Amino acid sequence: MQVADLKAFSKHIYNAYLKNFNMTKKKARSILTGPFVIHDIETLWQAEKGLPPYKEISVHVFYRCQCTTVETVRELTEFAKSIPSFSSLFLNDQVTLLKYGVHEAIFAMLASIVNKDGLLVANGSGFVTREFLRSLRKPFSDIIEPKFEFAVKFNALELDDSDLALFIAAIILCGDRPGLMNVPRVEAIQDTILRALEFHLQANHPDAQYLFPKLLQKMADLRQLVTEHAQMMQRIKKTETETSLHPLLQEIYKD
Amino acid sequence: DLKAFSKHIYNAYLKNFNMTKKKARSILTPFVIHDIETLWQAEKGLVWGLPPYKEISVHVFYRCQCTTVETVRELTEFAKSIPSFSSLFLNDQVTLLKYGVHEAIFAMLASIVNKDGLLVANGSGFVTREFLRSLRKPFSDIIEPKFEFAVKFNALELDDSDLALFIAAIILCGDRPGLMNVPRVEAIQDTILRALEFHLQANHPDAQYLFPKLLQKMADLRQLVTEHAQMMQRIKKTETETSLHPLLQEIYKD
Ligand SMILES: Cc1cnc(-c2ccc(C(F)(F)F)cc2)n1Cc1ccccc1OCCC[C@@H](C)CC(=O)O
Ligand SMILES: Cc1cnc(-c2ccc(C(F)(F)F)cc2)n1Cc1ccccc1OCCC[C@@H](C)CC(=O)O
């Protein structure tokens, strides 16, 4: 695959990204820099004016992280389907890739609707302050704060949508997911994306130093972020018998 | 939209292939090569950069080579004229020719062939199927299979205009290894097949079941070339004096 092929590869992947996600970084930045601030119980309740029956604040906020996560999984599945060589993989490989890398994607993208004071919710019509989310009882708060920690260090790399389209595709087409059927083919496609990614960054961030290796580490940082997250998800599955989990996320944390 | 599609692709054919089925039939109906004499005579009394002569079958084998290589360049130019093949990834363009040229070359073999042999030397010579059977193994086993096929496929009584489309659907197979953009190739294929489908209806009205028989024929050729690549391996191993044009080492490497 030539430099030109990879250039055209990026217009394709970017197009899939624009067609498919409702919230780009362009739409978010412009909103953030100038929605309803949800900073406490009065504000949440107001902002509420089909989730499980409301039990308690920390828990209902938990359920809204579920309603948002679910929505994004569907977005990425579509996004994955529009990646050039993905529709043409074993379906078992298509599911395994989604099942193991969607959460890395979600948290890489969450950085985009995040800043240091909180995040945009509800298609950018709401804003939940970092503080208020810090204030829900453990173990919910302790599942939310590390993702913020990550995001703030990641928006420092100052990436745009056309860069995130490739970063994200690189994460889904990861050929180390366990139980893959055709590992070398995935590894092919992945490598073609990290190559297209390498050239894109030369064009679009030419003074930027060391960007590519910086990005590969954050890929690794994400694996453990998800590892540390999945752990906590399991701790909720056990310590919080009353609290439920959408069956779409039941089959994700299945194995 | 489909009828225009056909005329275009047919023009790419006549532009790019010197020997069409039409030329080939109206001769078949040339100097016969049937033995060592006629061949050595052909080789001195027909004019058509070869390895120093080692033996007769190896020489025949390098002739096959001389020719398959030349047709691989024709199929290459020809594809540059199948609509939107040029606007695929150049690495996909390569992957399609590499894995598809031979299926193409043997579909087209049937055009210059009959039961008794093939035309050679751009129409000047005729080589009997007997003489080619005559040669020693592995060189006999490589040849005959094509002939069966060429004969049975010929009984479908296609013309060039059908061929020019069949050819393209064969190149445009989004089922090759290492294809980045599968569903784009599948879609150009789809258009080609629909065009060949309407073409057939228009060209061969009373003919029942012609199009689906064509799709098995496209299947058949993948298997044939699978056995042909198997067989070539036998020759990279056992015919160790006997070289292979670099361009073919390229296509077979994997
Ligand atoms: C990615 C995301 C996008 N929007 C939200 C989000 C919007 C509004 C509200 C609410 F308004 F309820 F506060 C809560 C959250 N999040 C969740 C989010 C953000 C920052 C830190 C941790 C987050 O969730 C971790 C827990 C998610 C799991 C329940 C489900 C799973 O893991 O699959
Ligand atoms: C397609 C074709 C067109 N013309 C010839 C041909 C013309 C003149 C003479 C002669 F007799 F002169 F040597 C031999 C052959 N052929 C070859 C052909 C015909 C019928 C059956 C098997 C055939 O080749 C299989 C072997 C091809 C490989 C060496 C290289 C490769 O696999 O790419």
Residues 6+ apart with CB under 8 A from A132: A38, A39, A40, A43, A44, A118
Closest C-alpha among B232, B67, B78 to residue B170: B78
Residue appearing with tokens 């489909």? B2
Inter-chain CB proximity A189 and B182 less than 8 Å? no
Whether the CB-CB separation of B203 and B159 falls below 8 Å is answered with yes
Closest C-alpha among B72, B64, B66, B34 to residue B49: B66
Whether the CB-CB separation of A127 and A118 falls below 8 Å is answered with yes
Residue appearing with tokens 């590892």? A227
Search chain A and give the residue with CA nearest B178.
Answer: A185
Closest C-alpha among A189, A172, A162 to residue A76: A172
Query: A96 is written with which tokens?
Result: 């395994």
* CB nearest B182 (choices: A2, A4, A88): A88
Whether the CB-CB separation of A133 and A141 falls below 8 Å is answered with yes
The answer for B 143-182 residues in CB contact with A (under 8 A) is 174, 178-182
Query: B143 is written with which tokens?
Result: 């040849």
**Which numbered ligand comes closest to the C-alpha of A70?**
1
Could you check whether the bond before residue B138 is cis, i.e. omega within 30 degrees of 0? yes
Whether the CB-CB separation of A212 and A197 falls below 8 Å is answered with yes
Mutate to test the pocket of ligand 2, among B59, B64, B127 (most ligand atoms within 8 A of CB): B64
Instruction: Note the Cα A253 to chain centre separation in Å.
Output: 16
CA dist A103 to A60, B60, B84, Å? 21, 61, 37
* CB nearest A84 (choices: B90, B178, B181): B181
Q: What is the resolution of this structure in A?
A: 2.8
Name the experimental technique: X-ray
Which of A6, A85, A193 to probe by mutation at the B interface, max B CB count within 10 Å? A85
Q: Is A15 on the interface with B (CB under 8 A)?
A: no
CA–CA gap between residue A37 and residue A29 (Å, rounded)? 16
CA dist B105 to A155, B69, B74, B135, Å? 55, 10, 10, 22
**Strands lying side by side in the sheet with A114-115:** A36-38, A126-129, A118-121, A114-115
Instruction: Give residue A59's domain range.
Output: 1-255
Whether the CB-CB separation of B123 and B111 falls below 8 Å is answered with no
Query: A196 is written with which tokens?
Result: 């297209």
Q: Is B90 on the interface with A (CB under 8 A)?
A: yes
Whether the CB-CB separation of A117 and A17 falls below 8 Å is answered with no
Q: Is B4 on the interface with A (CB under 8 A)?
A: no
CA dist B148 to A35, A96, B142, Å? 75, 45, 12
CA–CA gap between residue A100 and residue A105 (Å, rounded)? 10
CA–CA gap between residue A190 and residue B223 (Å, rounded)? 31
CA–CA gap between residue A83 and residue A172 (Å, rounded)? 10
* Å from CA of A69 to ligand 1 middle: 7
B181 interaction partners in chain A (CB closer than 8 Å): 84-85
Search chain B and give the residue with CA nearest A8.
Answer: B89
CA–CA gap between residue A195 and residue A13 (Å, rounded)? 13
Closest C-alpha among A197, A168, A183 to residue A83: A168
Instruction: Note the Cα B170 to chain centre separation in Å.
Output: 10
The count of structural domains within chain A is 1
* Å from CA of A144 to ligand 1 middle: 7
- Secondary structure of residue B161 in the 3-state scheme: helix
List phi, psi (to 5°) of A126: -120, 170
**Which numbered ligand comes closest to the C-alpha of A106?**
1
* CB nearest B91 (choices: A5, A87, A88): A5
Inter-chain CB proximity B90 and A192 less than 8 Å? no
CA–CA gap between residue A6 and residue A205 (Å, rounded)? 17
Q: Is B183 on the interface with A (CB under 8 A)?
A: yes
B174 interaction partners in chain A (CB closer than 8 Å): 88
Q: Please tell me what DSSP assigns to residue A9.
A: H
Whether the CB-CB separation of A181 and A208 falls below 8 Å is answered with no
CA–CA gap between residue B136 and residue B150 (Å, rounded)? 22
A88 interaction partners in chain B (CB closer than 8 Å): 174, 179, 182-183
Distance from the Cα of B187 to chain A's closest Cα (Å) equals 13
- Secondary structure of residue A115 in the 3-state scheme: strand
CA–CA gap between residue B81 and residue B93 (Å, rounded)? 12
DSSP B96-112: HHHHHHHHHHHHTGGGS
- Nearest Cα residue to atom 26 of ligand 1: A65
Inter-chain CB proximity B89 and A188 less than 8 Å? no
Distance from the Cα of A1 to chain B's closest Cα (Å) equals 5
- Secondary structure of residue A118 in the 3-state scheme: strand
CA–CA gap between residue B86 and residue B94 (Å, rounded)? 11
Closest C-alpha among A124, A146, A145 to residue A33: A124
DSSP B142-154: HHHHHHHHHHHHH
Whether the CB-CB separation of A161 and A18 falls below 8 Å is answered with yes
CA–CA gap between residue A248 and residue B159 (Å, rounded)? 56
Q: Is A155 exposed, middle or buried (0-12, 13-18, 19+ CB in 10 A)?
A: middle
Whether the CB-CB separation of B96 and B173 falls below 8 Å is answered with yes
For chain B, give the number of residues.
254
CA–CA gap between residue B3 and residue A245 (Å, rounded)? 56
* CB nearest A1 (choices: B89, B182, B184): B89
Search chain B and give the residue with CA nearest A191.
Answer: B180
- Secondary structure of residue B81 in the 3-state scheme: coil
